[PDB]
Amino acid sequence: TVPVALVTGAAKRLGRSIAEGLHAEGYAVCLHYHRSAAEANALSATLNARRPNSAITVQADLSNVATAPVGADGSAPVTLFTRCAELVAACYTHWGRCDVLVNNASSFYPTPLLRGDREAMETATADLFGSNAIAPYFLIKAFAHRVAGTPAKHRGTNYSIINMVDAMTNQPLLGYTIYTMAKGALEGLTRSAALELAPLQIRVNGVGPGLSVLVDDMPPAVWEGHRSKVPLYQRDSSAAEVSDVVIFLCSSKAKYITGTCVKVDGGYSLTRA
Amino acid sequence: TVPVALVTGAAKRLGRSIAEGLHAEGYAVCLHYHRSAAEANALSATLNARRPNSAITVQADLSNVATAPVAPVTLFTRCAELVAACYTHWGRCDVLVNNASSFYPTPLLRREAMETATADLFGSNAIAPYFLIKAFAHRVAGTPAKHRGTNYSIINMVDAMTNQPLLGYTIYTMAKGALEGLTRSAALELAPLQIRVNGVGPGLSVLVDDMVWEGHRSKVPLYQRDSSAAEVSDVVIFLCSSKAKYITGTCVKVDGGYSLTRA
Amino acid sequence: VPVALVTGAAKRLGRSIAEGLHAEGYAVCLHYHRSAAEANALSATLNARRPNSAITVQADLSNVATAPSAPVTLFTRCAELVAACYTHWGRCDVLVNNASSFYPTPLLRNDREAMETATADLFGSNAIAPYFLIKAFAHRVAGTPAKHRGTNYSIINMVDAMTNQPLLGYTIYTMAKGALEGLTRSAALELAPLQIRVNGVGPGLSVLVEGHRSKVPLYQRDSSAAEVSDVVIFLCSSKAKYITGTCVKVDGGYSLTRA
Amino acid sequence: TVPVALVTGAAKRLGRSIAEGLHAEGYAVCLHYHRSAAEANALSATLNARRPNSAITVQADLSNVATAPVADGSAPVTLFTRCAELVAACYTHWGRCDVLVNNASSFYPTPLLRNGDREAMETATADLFGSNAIAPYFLIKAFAHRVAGTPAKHRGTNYSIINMVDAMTNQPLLGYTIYTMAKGALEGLTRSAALELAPLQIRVNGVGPGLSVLVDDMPPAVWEGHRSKVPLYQRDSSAAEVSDVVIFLCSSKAKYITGTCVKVDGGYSLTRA
């Protein structure tokens, strides 16, 4: 009877803020994580403490690789598609529903054209394309099938899919090609899924941050200079300044919106060198 | 500290729903109208009944023309006077919604009406907005930083569908392209004053039953209908809320996936 | 012998476009506003290489009234431009909307008349004159009996690669270019049945009158005039006959940059 | 002395016309193919007949799969390896590669929604993404590497990369999600590679057809019905109407253009339902 949100990469930063923002609205939240088990279980505890049985954690590698079956007798590697189906399944198993999907998990590191390895280049392609593009596709598919399979009478009235894209990829970041192409893929998914799932009343939108919760592992004057180029406030956003938009888009007040993106970027994309 | 919204073309349809939506969030509302005096006054009455002194009306032709006093008055002056009306009455203006807009054909293919059409469609949709944003920014720049609002917001009502131009509506389409440029340019220049500038583009919203009505309706992917006024205004209201304080220079399409379509 | 009308033809890109079209065989109507000397000299060069292959026509393209029956509107001056082509050579196959004022209209200081002249000048040259010119052009074609019509009608609007990344203080200019982009799309749709193609070409930084230069990813300079005009010429060629309603950025990657 | 173009999926339709159009401008042309051996060899023969040693054919599956071991004896060949060998082929035979056209592309439905069912699935993802996006990336990588490796004194003066994108993908075709995502990934690559390869004076641009040489495998009236939708001419383009734009972009006349797309669609993207 309570709406259910699945949030990938939910353990920290903008994914946490999204899970939290949805939770404040009344959602039960499936918190996905890959490597951040401690932070995800802690976040779950906070949410459950405020409202019993309003959170769970599920672990999955969203890289475009087949994982190992759980080396022994009777099985076959688990495809990304299956791990994605199981994520959505986790929501139906536990709460009997899934109303909101947020595709937030994403790897982000350089793949330069101009310059051990083989494994680097192979793994990077799978990981960056998986997390940013191919997993969202399969996740959206599982999500869609399970609404299609729900008798109209038992269906939700506010199905929403949010894809976290990037406001800045038309102005690409030097050396981040695979990432950038993956976000471009994700933007196509938004449009194409919004079109094909319209008859089911599944809305599909994007939210593209500019600079948000900027990692500060660098000279302060450099961190500071990066920041200062956002026209608005001359700083990166907080997590909530992004997650609040995600929340609105999922609200029944946004039910005519589909197939679109909202940049949250402090006018950063308006800039030129 | 009641914040003040100026909404152009506020008397009916989407402008009314925006005035109402902002009113419900606590704004005092300057309702601009041109010809729809009766409807604007009635709406002001509703809002004032709910909350005393929370609404006024001001009349202005937003066409790019000079008018008379019975000095012809230029569009720039009428625009400045709109923003000034807000300061005179409540001593502030926090929100501006550029909503008023003419919309009729200017076919390229089968000089009196040509020029008045140009002035009207360009003025309402583009030039008046520019002047309004100018007046708005000047009043803020002139307010000592101590006494400034904390959530200045300008929303331009654009069009989701103008990349897929409506046949025979060239001037209108160009004016909306001009408005999109104003959104980006104003968002950049006013950032240092923390004035956010965004657009909202409806697709098909609140169709008068021109008969065919079912024709257009039926190729909106989402729901196969046009939107209600609130389905648009709610987005406007969000964009004006402090929760949307990192958003500037951008547009939100409210079109039910309509722009995703092809012939 | 096809005819091109080129607004703002006296110097810089307008001149390189006139020249580039002339080298392809076009007769060229060179429009100018103030640059009479330069336009007449250019016309002399072109006529010397090929007799009667160029003329000059003067018009303020600002959205004002000027000079006489009674005040002459922008619409009329625009019609007269296209008419000059038909009168002299009995045709007009290519239109290039190139003429364009470009100067600041700040929202924040750092009155009035300067603003109401600026509005009419920047919107007129960049957007309103183009519309009327496109209108005049389309009517002359619609009125030509089909068997007597050209086979490669082309309109090119000079837009701006960089206006999604607005130049600080240039709001009316930017809005006018956004207006011109809509004209491109709208005219391309409505004139398709007459086989009039309508496209845009957007320079980044071209022929600067260096800080800015060094910011361009490709070559770290501004373009030459020909680096822009050659694109225009291609779009006008029969090889480009399936292209309409689109823009080409000629910007050296400049619009790919961020601050 | 003679500039060299590599054209992927060159055997037929738009890729043949591109190879032909480059050939007419003086290029030697590496014509890659996958399943169309006969057409590619026949096209090579025409080009060689017209100008001796001005064409070669080379075969590669550009699907994102590992392939042809040394019956085997050993290790699987990576897509990246096959891609590098394509560009290598050009250097081995003619000592250069000036132009790369990423034209090969698979195109068939991947519906979100229902009514070889997971090999099909898996092979669709690798094939659509591979041909349309991942192989282009690796090809662009190999190409840039060989230029970077060329002493500036032995470097060509007109290096050009063209990615065949799609004018219509912002108006997505119902049921072709993966294809659409893949083209959005290719658009990312265009922008990103244009930025990163600028310092080596490698230009990187896209050309997006609307409807070109439309397959007529359907009731005439339905075929006529589809073309009739194009506002310009009410027909699909010919192959040359597309390839001539490609050729222009590669010409020295286009040397200031990089990081952009050119729609060749007859105004088709300007339409709405």
Ligand SMILES: NC(=O)c1ccc[n+]([C@@H]2O[C@H](COP(=O)([O-])OP(=O)(O)OC[C@H]3O[C@@H](n4cnc5c(N)ncnc54)[C@H](OP(=O)(O)O)[C@@H]3O)[C@@H](O)[C@H]2O)c1
């Ligand atoms: N922050 C920004 O300035 C910014 C800017 C533009 C766009 N965005 C987009 O906004 C979203 C959120 O931003 P963010 O900064 O919060 O993201 P983030 O901190 O970089 O990480 C998001 C989460 O994604 C998960 N992830 C990465 N690769 C994965 C894989 N192979 N399999 C499963 N999960 C994987 C990680 O989960 P675990 O820790 O559990 O392993 C990570 O915690 C991302 O999609 C991002 O690309 C962010």
Ligand SMILES: NC(=O)c1ccc[n+]([C@@H]2O[C@H](COP(=O)([O-])OP(=O)(O)OC[C@H]3O[C@@H](n4cnc5c(N)ncnc54)[C@H](OP(=O)(O)O)[C@@H]3O)[C@@H](O)[C@H]2O)c1
């Ligand atoms: N409705 C849609 O499907 C749709 C679609 C795309 C975009 N939009 C945009 O959304 C906004 C609102 O849509 P709408 O249908 O509610 O608007 P609307 O009914 O067509 O008109 C809005 C108001 O604009 C005022 N107006 C028109 N010309 C004016 C002028 N010369 N001077 C001063 N006021 C003038 C009129 O005020 P008076 O009645 O007082 O004279 C009119 O009531 C418009 O900007 C529109 O372009 C709407």
Ligand SMILES: NC(=O)c1ccc[n+]([C@@H]2O[C@H](COP(=O)([O-])OP(=O)(O)OC[C@H]3O[C@@H](n4cnc5c(N)ncnc54)[C@H](OP(=O)(O)O)[C@@H]3O)[C@@H](O)[C@H]2O)c1
């Ligand atoms: N150069 C660049 O870096 C750049 C960048 C982006 C876009 N563009 C676009 O490309 C085009 C050409 O650029 P450009 O630098 O060569 O242009 P430009 O030198 O600034 O000026 C073009 C011509 O426009 C004419 N003009 C200006 N105002 C006019 C008016 N009111 N009525 C009639 N003519 C008027 C002038 O003609 P007269 O001299 O005869 O008076 C001028 O020579 C322009 O549309 C421009 O916006 C250029």
Ligand SMILES: NC(=O)c1ccc[n+]([C@@H]2O[C@H](COP(=O)([O-])OP(=O)(O)OC[C@H]3O[C@@H](n4cnc5c(N)ncnc54)[C@H](OP(=O)(O)O)[C@@H]3O)[C@@H](O)[C@H]2O)c1
């Ligand atoms: N035709 C159109 O209306 C249209 C519209 C929009 C965009 N485009 C784009 O323009 C380009 C050309 O159009 P087109 O219609 O000529 O293309 P096409 O006929 O469908 O096929 C292009 C070639 O791609 C090759 N290819 C497909 N999958 C491959 C793979 N897994 N590995 C290696 N090669 C593979 C095929 O080569 P083999 O035959 O040798 O196996 C095929 O002949 C494509 O990128 C397309 O996306 C075309």
Ligand SMILES: COC(=O)C1CCN(C(=O)c2ccc(NCc3cnc4nc(N)nc(N)c4n3)cc2)CC1
């Ligand atoms: C080779 O390295 C370089 O050339 C630069 C890359 C940019 N750089 C940065 O510090 C930096 C970090 C984040 C930037 N963008 C914000 C962003 C975008 N997308 C993201 N996606 C995910 N998944 N996670 C993020 N944190 C993220 N951040 C931009 C620049 C310094 C070194």
Ligand SMILES: COC(=O)C1CCN(C(=O)c2ccc(NCc3cnc4nc(N)nc(N)c4n3)cc2)CC1
């Ligand atoms: C020459 O006439 C024609 O070719 C068509 C034009 C489209 N048509 C319509 O009924 C129609 C009406 C509104 C349409 N768009 C919605 C829209 C967009 N912008 C607007 N702006 C303002 N200011 N007001 C509106 N109502 C408005 N509506 C699209 C088609 C039938 C006749």
Ligand SMILES: COC(=O)C1CCN(C(=O)c2ccc(NCc3cnc4nc(N)nc(N)c4n3)cc2)CC1
């Ligand atoms: C208030 O002044 C300023 O803030 C800056 C404005 C930018 N500036 C420049 O030197 C400058 C000049 C041209 C620039 N863009 C190229 C451009 C774009 N459009 C044009 N349109 C026309 N019609 N003519 C041009 N020359 C032109 N140039 C960008 C920056 C220094 C001072």
Ligand SMILES: COC(=O)C1CCN(C(=O)c2ccc(NCc3cnc4nc(N)nc(N)c4n3)cc2)CC1
């Ligand atoms: C599930 O099937 C359907 O719903 C429709 C799909 C569209 N359809 C078509 O006949 C069709 C064919 C090509 C269309 N687009 C042109 C196009 C775009 N990209 C392409 N890419 C490649 N690689 N090859 C092409 N031939 C190609 N064609 C659009 C519609 C009929 C059935």
